[PDB]
């Protein structure tokens, strides 16, 4: 199986990598990097690696990201070492702030040049969070692409069509976190770990590698009609905000409990198939999750988005 | 026994809160209070009060003492609500950033102008922190003084005095959290649950009444001379960094296993007693930890230095 490290930059990747934690996602090597030294003490990661130790002692990069670019570039001997003999490195963060905007793009391109293949998933901040917020995003996202094969980005504003109307602003930055920790464990569960229908290494690499941006979509049901239903919430999901046939490449994962048919895979993957462009290059693979009853999930990542 | 919540603001708080209820501190209720969205996502406490989310859409208070100020000032209305009913309220924070400094002593005077006895117990900055940290520190520390009954204050640069010469910049951080929870637990303890040596409510209002500033000093100790090598190292910590016989109250807890003695918690109240002014108002009491083994644990609280 390939040799994973999960990167958490700065405060969005923080809190990303503990949820992954919390939902003991497996065969992964988890990072925690920031230049907040009180954050970085929330990890639950056993490695916590502080950045720009002389530049902020600790303080965090205050929301300007050639700070957090210089915090990374001080740090980038420590960093190196820590991701050489990856296969694969995800590098998660939330882009508008500091550390996330400007350390993430250089983490990266610090893992791509080690050869490493190399996803970014980051989250788009909330249009609420305002304009110094949106414009240092779109400059993170600029960089991010560089640094990367593929940068799935959430756009958080779709969040806010999935929640309940009157969610409190606090919860609705919990589920960003959670989104985030659905993009990576959606493409890690099929690949660090062993399973029946997992995916080839060889295969991922190649849907990664696409031009343009990556998008992703979330279906979760229960009971009858799951699969079909789960398939079609994630097709449908408002954070895959452009039709899934103008992608290049599709990834669906499915995970179940140990109920999950054959059947139910082969439902779900029709559906995300029949969505998708006649040319498309598609894979997909399924997941047990044995502490799941009733309720499945279908994840979808669609990559070389004009 | 005394109603009493404990309030984590800002980073510091929030890191304190978590250590507490890492190390099951009972018989207090937890609220951590922050403007920073993905900080508060963080926290372990049920209670998760969102501050200023006008004022800073869930961003922080970006190290400005003004902007946490206007954030509590915003939320005045839900922390008075939060905090009724409440006979005693910690209000923990680090000094120097904005949250901590600025929002800590609006929260403060709310509980205290509600009726509950108010214990600040908050770190002022290591001096590799910067200049800019040390003043806006200083500002904060005069605001809380006026808004409490006694601040404890932690002075970090001791901290260095007593982890080993090359602790990591990450770990003394992590150090100055647990030396707050040291703080808060060392009087929590006394009064919010049941035991043999409580203190008497009354008895702590009146130690806590006194003015100037306070201050802690923690001791650990194994074996045989435990009892008198803890309350040593209490007495001589870097973190009491005045002469406890300029001290007008001293309170003092001694936590230890099942198997702590009577002649032990006296042999230890004696020397504390003996190091202090003759006129000392000094109070004391013992708490089992059922599970510490063989350490003890001596906690001094010193109050009304000139
Ligand atoms: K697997
Ligand atoms: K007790």
Request: no cysteine; proline share 2%.
């Amino acid at each position: 199986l390939a040799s994973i490290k999960v990167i958490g930059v700065g405060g969005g990747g923080n809190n990303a990598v503990n949820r992954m934690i919390e939902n003991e996602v497996q065969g992964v090597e988890y990072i925690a990097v920031n230049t907040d030294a009180q954050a970085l003490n929330l990890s639950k990661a056993e490695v916590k690696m502080q950045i720009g130790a002389k530049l902020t002692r600790g303080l965090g990069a205050g929301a300007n990201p050639e700070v957090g670019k210089k915090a990374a570039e001080e740090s980038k001997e420590q960093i190196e070492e820590a991701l050489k003999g990856a296969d694969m490195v995800f590098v998660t963060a939330g882009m508008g702030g500091g550390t996330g905007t400007g350390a993430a793009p250089v983490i990266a391109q610090i893992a791509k040049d080690l050869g490493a293949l190399t996803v970014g998933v980051v989250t788009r901040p909330f249009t609420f969070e305002g304009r110094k917020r949106q414009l240092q995003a779109a400059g993170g996202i600029s960089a991010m692409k560089e640094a990367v094969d593929t940068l799935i980005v959430i756009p958080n504003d779709r969040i806010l069509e999935i929640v309940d109307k009157n969610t409190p602003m606090l919860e609705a930055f919990r589920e960003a976190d959670n989104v985030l920790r659905q993009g990576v464990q959606g493409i890690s569960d099929l690949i660090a770990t062993p399973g029946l229908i997992n995916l080839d290494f060889a295969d991922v690499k190649t849907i990664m590698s696409n031009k343009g941006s990556a998008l992703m979509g979330i279906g979760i049901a229960t009971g009858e009609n799951r699969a079909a239903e789960a398939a079609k919430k994630a097709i449908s999901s408002p954070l895959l905000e452009a039709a899934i046939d103008g992608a290049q490449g599709v990834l669906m994962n499915i995970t179940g409990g140990t109920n999950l048919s054959l059947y139910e895979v082969q439902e779900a993957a029709d559906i995300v198939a029949s969505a998708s462009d006649q040319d498309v290059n598609m894979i997909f693979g399924s997941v047990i999750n044995e502490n799941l009853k009733d309720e499945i999930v279908v994840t979808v990542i669609a990559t070389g988005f004009i």
